[PDB]
Amino acid sequence: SFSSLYKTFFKRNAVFVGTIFAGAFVFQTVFDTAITSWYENHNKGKLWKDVKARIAA
Amino acid sequence: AEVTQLSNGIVVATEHNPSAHTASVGVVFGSGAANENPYNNGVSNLWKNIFLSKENSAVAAKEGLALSSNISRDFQSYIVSSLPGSTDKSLDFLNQSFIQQKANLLSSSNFEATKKSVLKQVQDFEDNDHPNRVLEHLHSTAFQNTPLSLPTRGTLESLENLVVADLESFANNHFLNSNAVVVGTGNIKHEDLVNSIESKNLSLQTGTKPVLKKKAAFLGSEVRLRDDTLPKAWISLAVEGEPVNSPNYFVAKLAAQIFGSYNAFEPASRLQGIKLLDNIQEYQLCDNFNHFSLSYKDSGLWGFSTATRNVTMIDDLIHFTLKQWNRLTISVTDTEVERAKSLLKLQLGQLYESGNPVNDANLLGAEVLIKGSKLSLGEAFKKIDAITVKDVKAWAGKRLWDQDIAIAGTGQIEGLLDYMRIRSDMSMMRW
């Protein structure tokens, strides 16, 4: 964190609850997508989706 | 009728008062305790007392004159009072003390006797004057390691180490024509004074400029002088305020007037239009309090001082007061601002339109030294009446809201909570 970067968004005030809650909602979405993508990529070839791609009946 | 200001080498300033029955002539130097160091701290106070020494006072009394001297943070004064006719006799004494004499007042017996006198003086102040001792410590912690932190009376340690040479060094460095203003108040004309001054000659260290140093800085901090043997808790608390000649000088003074002063034992004081009074009288949180807006050349302090015997509820006293301060930023009303205007005008009028020439001398000299002139009540009142609720909120959001504080206290202060609990009260939770 850089002082001037923080000041451009909040000046010398702490972050208010309203903004904290709003940020938590955004965090939840972005964080989940990022983790899931990294996790599925790390296990590529082992997932059912990957197996179903080749295997069939 | 508008305060004259003339310069021929020596800057002379007067304020004629026709209703005055006396006259005050003296010299004000633009150097005070803020121009000393931790080791010669008290040198100015020592000078004040040798000037008020018996030998010097007896000489003045024979002439029907009275001596006055005040040691401040930014300035220092030496005034002589007399009848309007004996105004020239004042100048002779003044001239004598700061041009002719030197080794007379700085003699071994006079200096030592005076030194011993101020030593017992300062010892009594530090030992018994709790509200002022606390206010002095507020300045000390708020501006620590900075010029403004030094007490005006000096410290015992530095005082007992002071010698005649220290006095001389300070005099040679600060008692200069370029750092002075000769004042004239009460019943006297400018021409009468300027011609009487212009009558003599010489210069005594001409062109010599005073010493320079580093600027004052505010530091969020605290000094706690707990003493459980004292009957009360004395506390002073403040944020960085306004320096003299600040654009918010009056807005700050008005803000302080909103919360004002209070004396629980005075019936009318309990009836003031101050919202904080509704919170603190139920369980009688304090004996008295007074808000202030102290202004100096480099900085200032805005806050309050209070004394209380309610040692178990100090936390409520502080909490309610700071919660009220919070209001200046978000909800101060129009009537609170209007009440403050009227009372501020009265305060200034009582300060500047006092019936005392020595007071006028000190104020006149101090102001002309800082801004070259003295502001009139007419202009001051106009500025005050122009202050709006938005101006107060803008100033408070800058100086009060979520800002660092300086705290000082003595006595039974066990109940005064930690710094952070007090500091957190400088704001309120918001959605």
Ligand SMILES: CCCCCCCCCCCO[C@@H]1O[C@H](CO)[C@@H](O[C@H]2O[C@H](CO)[C@@H](O)[C@H](O)[C@H]2O)[C@H](O)[C@H]1O
């Ligand atoms: C049980 C589990 C649930 C956990 C939920 C987490 C709770 C988060 C609450 C977050 C913020 O709540 C928020 O806090 C900040 C202080 O940090 C408050 O700030 C307040 O104090 C700060 C600091 O002196 C000031 O700068 C600010 O102007 C003032 O409004 C803000 O008004 C409040 O709205």
